[PDB]
């Protein structure tokens, strides 16, 4: 569906992030999933590649308790460390390449924070009975 | 698990839409999933072609902000130039066979109006904080 | 329906100006805009344009000298031009951009169901 | 870049007569290109779109089809009032562009 796709990348990371379906759009199906084990295996080793690494993406949404929607709000905190700039200057004069090589550093100490979702999940049952 | 499985088909929509779970249980195993490379390798090729299936609905669900639950509401109003009929006289009289033939033509833009969910999330996030 | 537009002008080499168009019975929030301009005896110079979500695009022969912006209050659209040559006299016009076949987000299908009546600018000495 | 040229540089036709221009591309833009007219004094309009597809507004008489390189535009049976300077252009590579035009005179 390249009606539009990764251009978005062109602007700020606010502009961007109102078209991100039209990244997910494409992410499942290339030109061997729209269509002698000689050569031809090849396409079948891509198929079941490209299907494990949406997978694991998607279980680590699970396991964080943001499986669904596109913006996830996750009730952690964000460390003063990881980067010292207005939060509207990092949305309107950032792109996402940029962000994301400024804050590389820290990308496993966020996903491990992200584990207080666990804590969360007990509570609510405690008291929801 | 054929206890009951597309018998739904036989009758109405609006009967057929109590039983969806019948068929849902039904799409990921084929026989070869309840069980020389030559020959076998159909075997492999055809888990991995189901699995590919499966999971292309899932992501559009995912897309359109309908993953989970068999029946989404989407807040998308139906055009007067898709069908000409009551609603009961479609729910009452009509199967999911008849109905699907009938809108085929409009697949691809209802489809596109579903890429609305963004835009409601978007509002959703500024709005919530 | 249609694109209202400001008279021509006059100015010297070196100049700056400023060119207008304003959506009549519609929203310009809902469309991608964009404008051409037509030297004489030429066909439809792609000048400018911006998406619904604000963002741009130039081509190489104006960048750095032609700004586009809108203000979706007043239904306004601007071309701010600076440092003219008289090799910019041309005929430019507003244009909006076709409804695509399937959804793209804020790009454009660069082509054009509404144009504007045009508005001359000579540049000379 | 996609030039675009057109052929002939104009066409003498007369009244109700069956005609065509031709439009071709550098490079192969797939299906991607657009039909547009413009009479002298008048702003430019968009008859056909993506090679073949009709636009509200615009008569049935007029038609078209093309692909890759080569492109055509008809008019099953010309009218006074069909008098234009007819242009193609393409959307399949930025920047986009467009040809030189085709004037189409009514005897």
């Known amino acids: 569906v390249f009606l539009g796709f990764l251009g978005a990348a062109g602007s700020t990371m606010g502009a961007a992030s109102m078209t991100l379906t039209v990244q997910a759009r494409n992410l499942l199906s290339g030109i061997v999933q729209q269509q002698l084990t000689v050569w031809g295996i090849k396409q079948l080793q891509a198929r079941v590649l490209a299907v494990e690494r949406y997978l694991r993406d998607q279980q680590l949404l699970g396991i964080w308790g943001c499986s669904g929607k596109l913006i996830c709000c996750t009730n952690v905190p964000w460390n003063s460390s990881w980067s010292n700039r207005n939060l509207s200057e990092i949305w309107d004069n950032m792109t996402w390449l940029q962000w994301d090589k400024e804050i590389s550093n820290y990308t496993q100490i966020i996903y491990g924070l992200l584990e207080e979702s666990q804590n969360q999940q007990e509570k609510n049952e405690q008291d929801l009975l | 698990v054929f206890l009951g499985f597309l018998g739904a088909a036989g009758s109405t929509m609006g009967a057929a839409s109590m039983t969806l779970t019948v068929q849902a249980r039904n799409l990921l195993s084929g026989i070869v999933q309840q069980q020389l490379t030559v020959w076998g390798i159909k075997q492999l090729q055809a888990r991995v072609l189901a699995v590919e299936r499966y999971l292309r609905d899932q992501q559009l669900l995912g897309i359109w902000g309908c993953s989970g639950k068999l029946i989404c509401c989407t807040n998308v109003p139906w055009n007067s130039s898709w069908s000409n009929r009551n609603l009961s006289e479609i729910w009452d009289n009509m199967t999911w066979l008849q109905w699907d033939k009938e809108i085929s033509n409009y697949t691809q833009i209802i489809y596109g109006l579903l890429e609305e969910s963004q835009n409601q999330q978007e509002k959703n996030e500024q709005d919530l904080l | 329906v249609q694109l209202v537009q400001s008279g021509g002008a006059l100015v010297q080499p070196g100049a700056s100006l400023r060119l207008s168009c304003a959506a009549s019975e519609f929203s310009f929030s809902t469309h991608d805009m964009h404008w051409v301009r037509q030297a004489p005896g030429k066909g439809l110079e792609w000048v400018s344009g911006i998406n619904i979500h604000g963002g741009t695009y130039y081509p190489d022969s104006v960048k750095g000298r032609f700004t586009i912006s809108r203000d979706s209050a007043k239904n306004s659209l601007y071309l701010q031009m600076s440092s003219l040559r008289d090799g910019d006299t041309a005929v430019y016009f507003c244009?909006?951009?076709?409804?695509?076949?399937?959804?793209?987000?804020?790009?454009?299908?660069?082509?054009?169901?509404?144009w504007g009546p045009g508005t001359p600018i000579t540049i000379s000495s | 870049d996609v030039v675009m040229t057109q052929s002939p540089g104009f066409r003498s036709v007369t009244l109700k007569e069956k005609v065509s221009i031709t439009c071709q591309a550098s490079q192969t833009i797939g299906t991607n290109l657009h039909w547009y007219q413009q009479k002298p004094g008048q702003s430019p309009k968009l008859l056909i779109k993506?090679?073949?597809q009709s636009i509200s507004g615009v008569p049935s008489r007029f038609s078209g089809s093309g692909s890759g390189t080569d492109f055509t535009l008809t008019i099953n049976s010309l009218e006074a009032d069909d008098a234009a300077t007819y242009y193609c252009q393409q959307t399949n590579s930025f920047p986009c562009t467009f040809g030189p035009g085709t004037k189409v005179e009514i005897k």
């Open positions: 993506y090679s073949s």
């Open positions: 244009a909006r951009g076709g409804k695509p076949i399937y959804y793209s987000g804020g790009y454009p299908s660069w082509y054009f169901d509404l």
